[PDB]
């Protein structure tokens, strides 16, 4: 007698599913370089924690058409970002930060692998580039025009001259989707089936590591038991991640289960050997190379302040203090309806840096995993809904 959850043109769950009444907040934390001139001499960097810079997400569901017998549904999720000032520290258009010139590190990763090896190298020797740039916050995640990329845009007018962590993601989607609804069974409620036209990824090595399991982490199937391990496919993290049970914890009047990511999501366990994209060195525990899904950039993903990671990753940078309750990623779900109450997903973006003999802009720099910026994406269930869930 739980068919009021099922996705259909009639039930009250579709109104919740087209535009979630819960407001989602995203806050950005940058790492300011204190001693840039001393890193090139071959010394340990010192970073500083800047933020939060909080934005609010406008989540929609466009292009909806029922499929098969009504057992599947298709939609794209457009996400906008309204700037909330009262939770930020300063204006992102005025507040400057000094981080790595990531554009010129990508064009050296493109240099090797013989994308434009000859022309890229020649421009670099003619237009000297600084390893550490200084741009306003509003430019690092919402695009800024680089000299190198602009000149490459002439030869190949298919790569945009601007660069941004969230470049042109304001008001647009992140691919086509098609969801399994609940007629089949409750176990595949809002479950993921197909993404863009490939039933599974193929960036990674092993067939296991390329599989697409579970939901998109936005909703779950009802009748959640503390036995199982819920799988989640974040469209950004380039892999399917599972979250295991912790212990009981209540939010508002509702009961809830506390699901958190385990530590072998990122260790060099043999189960994750297919995730390091060259068969061999996995760069270590608590970190993941996500270069292939981005445009070849040496971007490395991890937890904020390298939580749940190795120890040489934390001492290689001054300013990294990892601890729970600050950088841990959790999801609080309702074991009855599978509807999510409170969450906090925390990702960090890094740049793998190394001294290279073929380029001066590196210098005698240490080989390390240099952090740049991280965030959480959070949601806290409103008060009026805590009373609406009633009369089972």
């Amino acid at each position, epitope marked *: 007698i739980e068919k009021k959850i099922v996705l259909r043109n009639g039930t009250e769950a579709f109104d919740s599913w087209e535009k979630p009444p819960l407001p989602v907040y995203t806050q950005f934390y940058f790492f300011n370089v204190t001693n840039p*001139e001393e890193i090139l001499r071959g010394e340990t960097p010192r970073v500083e924690e800047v933020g939060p810079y909080t934005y609010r997400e406008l989540r929609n569901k466009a292009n909806i058409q029922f499929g098969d017998n009504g057992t599947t549904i298709s939609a794209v999720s457009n996400k906008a970002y309204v700037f909330e000032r009262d939770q930020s520290v300063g204006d992102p258009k005025i507040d400057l930060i000094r981080t790595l010139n990531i554009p010129v590190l990508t064009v050296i990763e493109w240099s090797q692998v013989h994308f434009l090896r000859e022309i890229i190298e020649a421009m670099l*020797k003619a237009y000297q580039q600084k390893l550490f740039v200084t741009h306003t916050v509003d430019e690092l995640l919402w695009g800024y025009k680089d000299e190198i990329l602009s000149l490459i845009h002439v030869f190949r007018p298919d790569i945009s001259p601007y660069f941004g962590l969230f470049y042109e993601k304001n008001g647009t989607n992140d691919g086509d989707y098609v969801f399994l609804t609940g007629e089949d069974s409750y176990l595949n409620f809002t479950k993921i089936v197909e993404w863009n036209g490939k039933t599974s990824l193929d960036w990674w090595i092993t067939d296991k590591c390329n599989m697409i399991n579970g939901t998109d982490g936005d909703s779950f199937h009802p009748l959640i038991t503390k036995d199982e391990v819920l799988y989640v496919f974040p469209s950004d993290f380039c892999r399917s991640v599972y979250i295991t049970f912790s212990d009981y914890e209540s939010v508002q009047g509702l009961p809830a289960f506390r699901y958190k990511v385990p530590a072998e999501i990122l260790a060099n366990t043999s189960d994750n050997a297919g995730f390091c994209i060259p068969e061999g060195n996995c760069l270590g525990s608590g970190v993941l190379n996500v270069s292939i899904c981005k445009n070849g950039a040496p971007i490395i993903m991890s937890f904020p302040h390298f939580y749940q990671a190795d120890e040489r990753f934390v001492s290689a940078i001054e300013g990294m203090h990892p601890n729970q309750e600050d950088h841990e990623t959790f999801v609080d779900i309702n074991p009855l309806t599978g509807i999510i109450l409170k969450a906090a997903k925390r990702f960090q973006i890094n740049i793998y840096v190394k001294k290279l*003999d*073929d380029f001066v*802009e590196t*210098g005698d720099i240490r080989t390390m995993v240099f952090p740049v910026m991280y965030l959480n994406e959070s949601v806290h269930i409103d008060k009026e809904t805590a009373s609406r869930l009633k009369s089972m």
Partner: antibody
Amino acid sequence: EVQLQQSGPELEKPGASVKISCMASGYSFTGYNMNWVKQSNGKSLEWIGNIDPYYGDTRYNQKFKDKATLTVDKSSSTAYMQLKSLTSEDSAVYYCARSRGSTSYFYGMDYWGQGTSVTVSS
Amino acid sequence: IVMTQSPATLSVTPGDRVSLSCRASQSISDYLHWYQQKSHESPRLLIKYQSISGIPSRFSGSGSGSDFTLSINSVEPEDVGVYYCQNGHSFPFTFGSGTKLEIKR
């Protein structure tokens, strides 16, 4: 292992010119400055200049400078000195050494070649 | 750019603490390099910016701006040679005159 191998000991008539070469190995020569240093018999080294083949520049000491022309180390593997207007006072040992320095700050001299004793005499 | 270092010939018993002062007319921040030359050997780097470097010994250096110092914990008979400080901050990186130490036996 950097194996900076230089060079042949030489002599020349007063007023002539001699050229030297460092011909390094074991590293990607580009982005390494390759400095030149002279040392009279009475020790007390003096730094003549560098090249830095990556950007394509030169840096010379002005008072000393008239004499030597550090031609482009030929982006292949070799260093050229080419001292001119030889004087009997220039008889000394000439060392060379690479530098990992970028722009205006010196990063020190990693490795050195054994040097060449240039004897200016007739 | 000119800089000088004192003294001009030391004698160690050996095994003693030694003070080697390098002072520059202009301020350099912390860019001193301290090279070592033996009898018939090319000079070799010891300390990069009055900070530990190289990889083969104790030698230590300190200071900031002007008036730098290189010091040895204890002297062994295989430290005989000459020592030269190096300006790093301002072109031409100007080498200083030699110290050169004799060893007492």
